[PDB]
């Protein structure tokens, strides 16, 4: 079975409880492994409103990966040939659950926008 230390994470601050997980091998993650492995993490798969939540606060990346009901999305930004072909917002193929891809994960402990940045404390 898929293990944790097969996987990468791209994406080491998260964005509105946002990550991005990878493979460690050239062979990636079809849609089932998707969801395995945000859960080996302790993490739901995320859906693509979830995404969209995060790109509202600049969350952005180039590598395709899946999301829950069985879509593959990139989030940008800005336009880049190399990343999504100059695409803008989250952009949404669905495509044959078998390709292999990276998997977009969710946080829902995550009380910060951007996990690596404190907010201030109410008491
Ligand atoms: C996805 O990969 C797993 C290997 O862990 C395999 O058992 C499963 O059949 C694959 N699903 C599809 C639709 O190819
Ligand atoms: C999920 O978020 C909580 C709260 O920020 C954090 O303690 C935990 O490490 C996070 N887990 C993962 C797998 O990102």
């Not at 590598?63 to 989030?75: C, E």
């Not at 930004?77 to 390709?99: E, Q, T």
């Amino acid at each position: 079975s898929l293990r944790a230390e097969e996987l990468s994470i791209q994406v080491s601050c998260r964005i509105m409880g946002i990550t991005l997980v990878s493979k460690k091998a050239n062979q990636q993650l079809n849609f089932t492994e998707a969801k395995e492995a945000c859960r080996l993490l302790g993490l739901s798969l995320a859906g693509k409103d979830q995404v969209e939540t995060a790109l509202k606060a600049s969350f952005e990346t180039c590598s395709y990966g899946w999301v829950g009901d069985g879509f593959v999305v990139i989030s940008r930004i800005s336009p880049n040939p190399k990343c999504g072909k100059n695409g803008v917002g989250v952009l949404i193929w669905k495509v044959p659950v078998s390709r292999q891809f990276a998997a977009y994960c969710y946080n829902s402990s995550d009380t910060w926008t951007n996990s690596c940045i404190p907010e201030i404390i109410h008491h």
